[PDB]
Symmetry: C3
Subunit: 208 residues, 3 copies
Amino acid sequence: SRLADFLGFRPKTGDIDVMNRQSVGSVTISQLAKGFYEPNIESAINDVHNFSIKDVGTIITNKTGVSPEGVSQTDYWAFSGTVTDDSLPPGSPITVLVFGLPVSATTGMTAIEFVAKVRVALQEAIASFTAINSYKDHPTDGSKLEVTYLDNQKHVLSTYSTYGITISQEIISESKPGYGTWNLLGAQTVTLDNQQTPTVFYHFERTA
Amino acid sequence: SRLADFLGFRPKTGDIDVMNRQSVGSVTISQLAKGFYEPNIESAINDVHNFSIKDVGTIITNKTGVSPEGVSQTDYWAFSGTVTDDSLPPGSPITVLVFGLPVSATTGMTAIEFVAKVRVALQEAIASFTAINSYKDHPTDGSKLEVTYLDNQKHVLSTYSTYGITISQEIISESKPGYGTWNLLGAQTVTLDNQQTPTVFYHFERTA
Amino acid sequence: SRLADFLGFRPKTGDIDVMNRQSVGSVTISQLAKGFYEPNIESAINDVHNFSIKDVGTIITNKTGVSPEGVSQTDYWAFSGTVTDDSLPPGSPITVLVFGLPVSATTGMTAIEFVAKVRVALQEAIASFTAINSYKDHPTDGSKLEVTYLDNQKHVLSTYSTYGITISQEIISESKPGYGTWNLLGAQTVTLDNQQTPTVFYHFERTA
């Protein structure tokens, strides 16, 4: 169990949206088993989660032909400076945190050299399925890396400096809401009632 | 960041609803960059938010003809009494909190006079886009004000007295679930497969 | 009040999904009235809740014919051992917590005898609309009980032992996302644009 299970949540008065009988956030057996008996955040989030995901086989219709599937954000991670820590002799091994990822560097490294070590940290995050989906080298800049996340949430990271290296984010493509896997079944032309102009609808089915 | 980024969330076992890869609440680069490495509430809420907003161009169909758009609650805030502060002399300036809004009042003011000060606090909340969308004077009662909120959540405010002034809430119009801007495309009369009577469906397209 | 009203939430940058005006989690009059002026968890969950529940009359379409309604999880509560407490005399009445439920027990009881006390626990929980929806006796094993929860969230309980008795969980039927009451209006066979094969769609209307 985590903090959320034990953080109180104030349910809406008269709310019975959960299985036609109780309010979002109502305590569940999961909390009772740990000795908590109040409506809580864990329960509330799980409830809304259950309201938003439609069953496989469900159909979503739109007039754009754009998939309902979510899209992950992709950025450029940029670096500048020289790894510095004057309290240590040149070439001393140190750990530098890059947006939370521990990077093994050495004092004296230029940004170009440092970036090579960031590649290794990204590989490790990817391998443990932690936040990072994939990365690629920048085609014309050795001090930048392209990174794509696992989730499709929006991330705006603050620029900062650590051990002489300035780290910043440059958003390349925005994320897009959505979930699951959807298949374009096709199009259906329909002339709405009492109208003469036809409208083309595109139907998507959730396959996974 | 305040706290949500640093509050643990227990993910659902077997959950891969986020981009067909991970559970709602899985740690993201935003938390890593702040020094938090576990599944959390900030991320969980952002994930469900991503599941609940359909893309512009999406079609919603119903049989009522009622728009999917949300509606904010509207109240009457009522006041009565005289601003009092036995600890201070008549006419002494004081700050009174009206449902959290700071009102500049003076001991000795009548409820009607106080309401005039409340109008100023509402204007300031409106100008800073803080919870209040708009307000209007009660047509025939100088001790009441009509107020509409920015969000479309339900709000039940408790009656209370502060510095001699009793403040209460009278809900005029209920809020309604929903989001975005939707446009009625028209109607579609359809006779389901083995049926005798036609069914009229209304289609709404999200435009913003 | 509850803690959620006072825990900060970091809004999504550029987010105006709430009434086309503000971000999910923006402060509302409910928090202001309690002295909290920042974006928060309570508001955030309430906003997403407002996005995910579609109005009565809304139509959901799928190709499986499976109801969009949610389904609660159902388990088997297993018990083993003998009610013990060497610090007290035999038959001494004690309070045993079963997944948070307080059962009136007495040292010396066998697993079967204990279950009888558990039935009364589930009864008071059910009558109190607390987490438990219903319950029945195991088809065969008298040391087990079938239970169904009010919510449709997934629950994984850890096996534990207290007062000599070992309590365990066995998930029988998995829960399913969903909400409200939906009515299958019927089927609609349509041949999508330029297709030689017809597809059958099932339309469900939210009645409650």
